[PDB]
Enzyme design. Structure first.
Site, mmCIF file in Angstrom:
data_model
loop_
_atom_site.group_PDB
_atom_site.id
_atom_site.type_symbol
_atom_site.label_atom_id
_atom_site.label_comp_id
_atom_site.label_asym_id
_atom_site.label_seq_id
_atom_site.Cartn_x
_atom_site.Cartn_y
_atom_site.Cartn_z
ATOM 1 N N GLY A 207 0.789 -1.218 0.000
ATOM 2 C CA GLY A 207 0.000 0.000 0.000
ATOM 3 C C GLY A 207 0.823 1.270 0.000
ATOM 4 N N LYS A 208 0.385 2.284 -0.741
ATOM 5 C CA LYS A 208 1.080 3.565 -0.810
ATOM 6 C C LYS A 208 0.217 4.636 -0.152
ATOM 7 C CE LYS A 208 4.291 2.990 -4.642
ATOM 8 N NZ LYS A 208 4.982 3.742 -5.736
ATOM 9 N N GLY A 209 0.681 5.149 0.988
ATOM 10 C CA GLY A 209 0.042 6.248 1.673
ATOM 11 C C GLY A 209 0.923 7.490 1.677
ATOM 12 N N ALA A 210 0.310 8.611 2.059
ATOM 13 C CA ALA A 210 1.017 9.888 2.035
ATOM 14 C C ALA A 210 2.048 10.012 3.147
ATOM 15 C CB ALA A 210 0.023 11.043 2.135
ATOM 16 N N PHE A 211 1.901 9.254 4.228
ATOM 17 C CA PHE A 211 2.829 9.333 5.341
ATOM 18 C C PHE A 211 3.597 8.045 5.582
ATOM 19 C CE2 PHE A 211 1.696 13.458 7.083
ATOM 20 C CZ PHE A 211 0.461 13.678 6.509
ATOM 21 N N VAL B 90 3.443 0.598 2.906
ATOM 22 C CA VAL B 90 3.325 -0.742 3.462
ATOM 23 C C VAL B 90 3.854 -1.738 2.440
ATOM 24 C CG1 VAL B 90 1.788 -2.476 4.394
ATOM 25 C CG2 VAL B 90 1.416 -0.067 4.911
ATOM 26 N N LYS C 282 4.926 -1.528 7.845
ATOM 27 C CA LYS C 282 4.587 -0.141 7.560
ATOM 28 C C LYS C 282 5.854 0.681 7.762
ATOM 29 C CE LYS C 282 1.106 2.623 9.651
ATOM 30 N NZ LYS C 282 -0.379 2.783 9.753
ATOM 31 N N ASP D 238 -10.924 7.268 13.965
ATOM 32 C CA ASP D 238 -10.867 7.379 12.509
ATOM 33 C C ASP D 238 -11.340 6.084 11.848
ATOM 34 O OD1 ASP D 238 -10.397 8.781 10.130
ATOM 35 O OD2 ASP D 238 -8.380 7.933 9.947
#
Length: 300
Positions: free
Chosen positions: A23-27, A30, A45, A138
Protein backbone atom coordinates in the site's frame (compact mmCIF):
# COMPACT_ATOMS: atom_id res chain seq x y z
CA UNK A 1 9.46 -0.97 20.41
CA UNK A 2 12.84 -2.40 19.36
CA UNK A 3 15.23 0.55 19.16
CA UNK A 4 18.40 -1.59 19.14
CA UNK A 5 17.68 -4.39 16.66
CA UNK A 6 17.18 -3.61 12.99
CA UNK A 7 13.94 -4.56 11.29
CA UNK A 8 16.13 -5.79 8.43
CA UNK A 9 17.83 -8.21 10.83
CA UNK A 10 14.58 -10.00 11.74
CA UNK A 11 12.56 -9.42 8.56
CA UNK A 12 13.43 -9.63 4.87
CA UNK A 13 12.05 -7.27 2.22
CA UNK A 14 13.36 -5.36 -0.79
CA UNK A 15 11.85 -1.92 -0.25
CA UNK A 16 12.90 -1.00 -3.81
CA UNK A 17 10.94 -3.76 -5.58
CA UNK A 18 7.49 -2.75 -6.79
CA UNK A 19 5.85 -6.14 -6.18
CA UNK A 20 6.65 -5.82 -2.46
CA UNK A 21 4.47 -2.72 -1.97
CA UNK A 22 1.13 -3.61 -0.39
CA UNK A 23 0.00 0.00 0.00
CA UNK A 24 1.08 3.56 -0.81
CA UNK A 25 0.04 6.25 1.67
CA UNK A 26 1.02 9.89 2.03
CA UNK A 27 2.83 9.33 5.34
CA UNK A 28 3.92 5.69 5.08
CA UNK A 29 4.38 2.82 2.66
CA UNK A 30 3.32 -0.74 3.46
CA UNK A 31 5.50 -3.53 2.03
CA UNK A 32 5.15 -7.30 2.16
CA UNK A 33 8.01 -8.69 4.26
CA UNK A 34 8.94 -12.14 5.55
CA UNK A 35 10.14 -13.03 9.04
CA UNK A 36 13.71 -14.25 8.59
CA UNK A 37 13.38 -16.74 11.45
CA UNK A 38 9.78 -17.99 11.29
CA UNK A 39 8.89 -17.47 7.63
CA UNK A 40 5.74 -15.61 8.62
CA UNK A 41 4.47 -13.26 5.91
CA UNK A 42 3.90 -9.78 7.34
CA UNK A 43 3.02 -6.24 6.27
CA UNK A 44 5.69 -3.78 7.38
CA UNK A 45 4.59 -0.14 7.56
CA UNK A 46 7.68 1.91 6.68
CA UNK A 47 7.68 5.53 7.86
CA UNK A 48 10.65 7.70 6.93
CA UNK A 49 11.59 10.07 9.76
CA UNK A 50 13.08 12.70 7.41
CA UNK A 51 10.58 15.57 7.17
CA UNK A 52 8.65 14.53 10.29
CA UNK A 53 7.92 17.15 12.93
CA UNK A 54 7.95 16.06 16.56
CA UNK A 55 4.14 15.88 16.71
CA UNK A 56 4.05 13.33 13.89
CA UNK A 57 6.77 11.16 15.45
CA UNK A 58 4.97 11.11 18.79
CA UNK A 59 1.75 10.34 16.96
CA UNK A 60 3.56 7.30 15.57
CA UNK A 61 4.89 6.26 18.98
CA UNK A 62 1.34 6.60 20.30
CA UNK A 63 0.16 4.32 17.51
CA UNK A 64 2.84 1.82 18.52
CA UNK A 65 1.84 1.78 22.18
CA UNK A 66 -1.85 1.41 21.38
CA UNK A 67 -1.26 -1.21 18.68
CA UNK A 68 0.88 -3.23 21.08
CA UNK A 69 -1.84 -2.99 23.75
CA UNK A 70 -4.33 -4.56 21.31
CA UNK A 71 -4.52 -8.33 20.82
CA UNK A 72 -7.84 -9.22 19.18
CA UNK A 73 -8.94 -11.43 16.30
CA UNK A 74 -10.61 -8.52 14.46
CA UNK A 75 -7.77 -6.04 14.98
CA UNK A 76 -4.78 -6.25 12.63
CA UNK A 77 -2.12 -7.34 15.11
CA UNK A 78 1.16 -5.45 15.24
CA UNK A 79 3.82 -8.15 15.58
CA UNK A 80 6.67 -5.79 16.46
CA UNK A 81 7.76 -2.19 15.96
CA UNK A 82 11.22 -0.89 15.10
CA UNK A 83 12.90 2.51 15.00
CA UNK A 84 16.35 3.16 13.60
CA UNK A 85 18.06 6.44 12.68
CA UNK A 86 15.88 7.12 9.63
CA UNK A 87 12.77 4.94 9.63
CA UNK A 88 9.97 3.47 11.66
CA UNK A 89 9.08 -0.12 10.79
CA UNK A 90 5.69 -1.25 12.11
CA UNK A 91 5.42 -4.98 11.39
CA UNK A 92 1.80 -6.16 11.23
CA UNK A 93 0.09 -9.47 10.56
CA UNK A 94 -0.42 -10.00 6.85
CA UNK A 95 -3.82 -8.90 5.55
CA UNK A 96 -4.57 -9.82 1.94
CA UNK A 97 -8.32 -9.42 1.52
CA UNK A 98 -8.23 -5.69 0.94
CA UNK A 99 -10.83 -3.18 2.02
CA UNK A 100 -14.21 -4.64 3.00
CA UNK A 101 -16.12 -2.21 0.78
CA UNK A 102 -13.97 -3.08 -2.23
CA UNK A 103 -14.91 -6.74 -1.71
CA UNK A 104 -18.64 -6.40 -1.02
CA UNK A 105 -19.08 -4.84 -4.47
CA UNK A 106 -17.64 -8.04 -5.97
CA UNK A 107 -20.06 -10.37 -4.16
CA UNK A 108 -22.85 -12.07 -6.08
CA UNK A 109 -24.91 -12.16 -2.87
CA UNK A 110 -24.98 -9.56 -0.12
CA UNK A 111 -27.74 -9.05 2.43
CA UNK A 112 -28.30 -7.55 5.87
CA UNK A 113 -27.00 -10.75 7.46
CA UNK A 114 -23.60 -10.26 5.82
CA UNK A 115 -23.64 -6.61 6.87
CA UNK A 116 -24.45 -7.77 10.40
CA UNK A 117 -21.53 -10.21 10.39
CA UNK A 118 -19.20 -7.41 9.30
CA UNK A 119 -20.63 -5.01 11.87
CA UNK A 120 -20.45 -7.73 14.50
CA UNK A 121 -16.72 -8.16 13.90
CA UNK A 122 -16.12 -4.39 13.82
CA UNK A 123 -18.13 -3.96 17.01
CA UNK A 124 -16.32 -6.76 18.84
CA UNK A 125 -12.93 -5.29 17.93
CA UNK A 126 -14.23 -1.93 19.14
CA UNK A 127 -15.37 -3.55 22.39
CA UNK A 128 -11.80 -4.73 22.92
CA UNK A 129 -10.51 -1.24 22.16
CA UNK A 130 -12.95 0.66 24.39
CA UNK A 131 -12.43 -1.88 27.18
CA UNK A 132 -8.82 -0.68 27.14
CA UNK A 133 -9.96 2.98 26.98
CA UNK A 134 -8.82 3.29 23.36
CA UNK A 135 -10.71 5.52 20.91
CA UNK A 136 -9.90 4.71 17.27
CA UNK A 137 -11.29 8.15 16.23
CA UNK A 138 -10.87 7.38 12.51
CA UNK A 139 -13.12 4.45 11.60
CA UNK A 140 -13.69 4.40 7.83
CA UNK A 141 -13.87 1.81 5.02
CA UNK A 142 -10.14 2.25 4.44
CA UNK A 143 -9.54 0.86 7.95
CA UNK A 144 -11.95 -2.10 7.56
CA UNK A 145 -9.90 -4.88 5.98
CA UNK A 146 -10.39 -8.55 5.17
CA UNK A 147 -7.75 -11.00 6.39
CA UNK A 148 -7.75 -12.98 3.13
CA UNK A 149 -9.38 -13.10 -0.29
CA UNK A 150 -11.24 -16.14 1.02
CA UNK A 151 -15.01 -15.97 1.58
CA UNK A 152 -15.96 -15.79 5.25
CA UNK A 153 -12.58 -14.18 5.95
CA UNK A 154 -12.65 -12.11 9.15
CA UNK A 155 -13.03 -8.35 9.12
CA UNK A 156 -10.12 -6.64 10.89
CA UNK A 157 -9.92 -2.96 11.81
CA UNK A 158 -6.59 -1.18 11.47
CA UNK A 159 -4.72 2.15 11.33
CA UNK A 160 -4.63 3.39 14.94
CA UNK A 161 -2.50 6.42 14.05
CA UNK A 162 -5.29 8.75 15.16
CA UNK A 163 -6.15 6.51 18.12
CA UNK A 164 -6.12 8.10 21.57
CA UNK A 165 -6.18 6.76 25.12
CA UNK A 166 -8.99 8.14 27.29
CA UNK A 167 -7.87 8.14 30.93
CA UNK A 168 -10.37 10.45 32.68
CA UNK A 169 -13.72 10.22 30.93
CA UNK A 170 -14.74 12.62 28.15
CA UNK A 171 -11.62 14.51 27.08
CA UNK A 172 -10.64 16.78 24.19
CA UNK A 173 -8.20 14.94 21.93
CA UNK A 174 -8.32 17.43 19.05
CA UNK A 175 -10.25 17.64 15.80
CA UNK A 176 -9.33 14.54 13.78
CA UNK A 177 -11.02 11.96 11.60
CA UNK A 178 -12.37 11.92 8.08
CA UNK A 179 -15.25 14.37 7.58
CA UNK A 180 -17.99 11.96 6.51
CA UNK A 181 -17.57 9.86 9.67
CA UNK A 182 -16.95 12.68 12.16
CA UNK A 183 -19.07 12.60 15.30
CA UNK A 184 -21.04 15.74 16.19
CA UNK A 185 -19.12 16.07 19.46
CA UNK A 186 -15.80 16.21 17.60
CA UNK A 187 -17.16 18.77 15.13
CA UNK A 188 -18.33 20.87 18.09
CA UNK A 189 -14.78 20.43 19.49
CA UNK A 190 -16.15 19.45 22.90
CA UNK A 191 -14.54 16.71 25.03
CA UNK A 192 -15.46 13.31 23.62
CA UNK A 193 -15.04 9.62 24.38
CA UNK A 194 -15.48 6.17 22.83
CA UNK A 195 -18.98 7.12 21.61
CA UNK A 196 -17.36 8.78 18.58
CA UNK A 197 -16.35 5.35 17.28
CA UNK A 198 -19.97 4.23 17.70
CA UNK A 199 -21.00 7.18 15.55
CA UNK A 200 -18.67 6.09 12.75
CA UNK A 201 -20.08 2.57 13.00
CA UNK A 202 -23.54 3.98 12.38
CA UNK A 203 -22.29 5.85 9.33
CA UNK A 204 -20.54 2.67 8.21
CA UNK A 205 -23.55 0.45 8.87
CA UNK A 206 -25.76 2.82 6.85
CA UNK A 207 -23.39 2.45 3.90
CA UNK A 208 -23.26 -1.33 4.38
CA UNK A 209 -27.03 -1.39 3.86
CA UNK A 210 -27.56 1.00 0.93
CA UNK A 211 -24.19 1.92 -0.60
CA UNK A 212 -24.18 5.68 0.06
CA UNK A 213 -23.35 7.71 3.19
CA UNK A 214 -26.03 9.40 5.31
CA UNK A 215 -24.04 12.66 5.43
CA UNK A 216 -22.73 13.60 1.99
CA UNK A 217 -21.79 17.16 1.10
CA UNK A 218 -18.86 18.57 -0.86
CA UNK A 219 -18.88 21.74 1.25
CA UNK A 220 -17.41 20.53 4.54
CA UNK A 221 -19.21 23.29 6.43
CA UNK A 222 -22.62 22.13 5.21
CA UNK A 223 -21.46 18.56 5.89
CA UNK A 224 -20.49 19.35 9.48
CA UNK A 225 -23.84 21.15 9.75
CA UNK A 226 -25.66 18.01 8.59
CA UNK A 227 -23.73 15.95 11.13
CA UNK A 228 -24.33 18.33 14.05
CA UNK A 229 -28.08 18.58 13.39
CA UNK A 230 -28.18 14.84 12.57
CA UNK A 231 -29.76 15.57 9.17
CA UNK A 232 -30.05 12.19 7.47
CA UNK A 233 -32.93 10.01 6.33
CA UNK A 234 -33.94 6.61 5.00
CA UNK A 235 -34.99 7.43 1.42
CA UNK A 236 -37.36 5.21 -0.52
CA UNK A 237 -37.14 2.79 -2.25
CA UNK A 238 -33.75 1.53 -1.04
CA UNK A 239 -34.70 1.57 2.65
CA UNK A 240 -38.20 0.14 2.20
CA UNK A 241 -36.64 -3.34 1.94
CA UNK A 242 -34.48 -2.83 5.06
CA UNK A 243 -35.48 -4.30 8.41
CA UNK A 244 -36.74 -1.76 10.92
CA UNK A 245 -34.26 -3.41 13.30
CA UNK A 246 -31.35 -2.15 11.21
CA UNK A 247 -32.98 1.28 10.85
CA UNK A 248 -33.45 1.54 14.62
CA UNK A 249 -29.88 0.35 15.21
CA UNK A 250 -28.56 3.12 12.95
CA UNK A 251 -30.83 5.69 14.60
CA UNK A 252 -29.28 4.65 17.92
CA UNK A 253 -25.68 4.64 16.68
CA UNK A 254 -26.30 8.10 15.17
CA UNK A 255 -27.62 9.66 18.38
CA UNK A 256 -26.46 13.32 18.34
CA UNK A 257 -25.69 13.27 22.09
CA UNK A 258 -23.00 10.80 23.23
CA UNK A 259 -24.70 10.17 26.58
CA UNK A 260 -27.82 8.84 24.83
CA UNK A 261 -25.59 6.86 22.44
CA UNK A 262 -25.20 3.12 23.03
CA UNK A 263 -21.91 1.71 24.14
CA UNK A 264 -20.36 -0.96 21.94
CA UNK A 265 -21.41 -3.65 24.44
CA UNK A 266 -25.04 -2.53 24.24
CA UNK A 267 -24.71 -2.59 20.45
CA UNK A 268 -23.31 -6.13 20.54
CA UNK A 269 -26.45 -7.07 22.48
CA UNK A 270 -28.76 -5.50 19.87
CA UNK A 271 -31.07 -8.04 18.17
CA UNK A 272 -29.86 -7.06 14.68
CA UNK A 273 -26.29 -7.94 15.76
CA UNK A 274 -26.70 -10.82 18.24
CA UNK A 275 -29.61 -12.73 16.66
CA UNK A 276 -28.62 -14.53 13.47
CA UNK A 277 -32.11 -14.19 11.95
CA UNK A 278 -33.16 -10.60 12.72
CA UNK A 279 -31.23 -9.00 9.79
CA UNK A 280 -32.86 -9.19 6.39
CA UNK A 281 -32.08 -12.00 3.99
CA UNK A 282 -32.94 -10.59 0.56
CA UNK A 283 -30.02 -9.76 -1.73
CA UNK A 284 -29.44 -6.00 -2.07
CA UNK A 285 -28.05 -5.52 -5.57
CA UNK A 286 -28.88 -1.80 -5.45
CA UNK A 287 -26.60 -1.54 -2.42
CA UNK A 288 -23.83 -3.15 -4.48
CA UNK A 289 -24.19 -0.79 -7.46
CA UNK A 290 -24.50 2.30 -5.27
CA UNK A 291 -21.50 0.98 -3.35
CA UNK A 292 -19.46 0.79 -6.57
CA UNK A 293 -20.38 4.43 -7.14
CA UNK A 294 -19.37 5.20 -3.53
CA UNK A 295 -16.00 3.42 -3.72
CA UNK A 296 -15.39 5.31 -6.96
CA UNK A 297 -16.33 8.63 -5.38
CA UNK A 298 -14.13 8.50 -2.27
CA UNK A 299 -10.90 7.74 -4.16
CA UNK A 300 -11.51 10.62 -6.56
Amino acid sequence: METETSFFDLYDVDLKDKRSVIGKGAFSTVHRCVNKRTGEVCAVKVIALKSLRSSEINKIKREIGICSSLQHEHIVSMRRAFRDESHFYLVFEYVSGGELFDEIVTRKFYNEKDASACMHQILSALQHCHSKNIIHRDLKPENLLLASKDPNAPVKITDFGLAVIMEQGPTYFGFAGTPGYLSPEVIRRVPYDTAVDVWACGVILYILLVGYPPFWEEDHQKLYAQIKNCQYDFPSPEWDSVTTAAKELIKAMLEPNPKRRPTVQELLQHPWIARRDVPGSVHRQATLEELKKFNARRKL
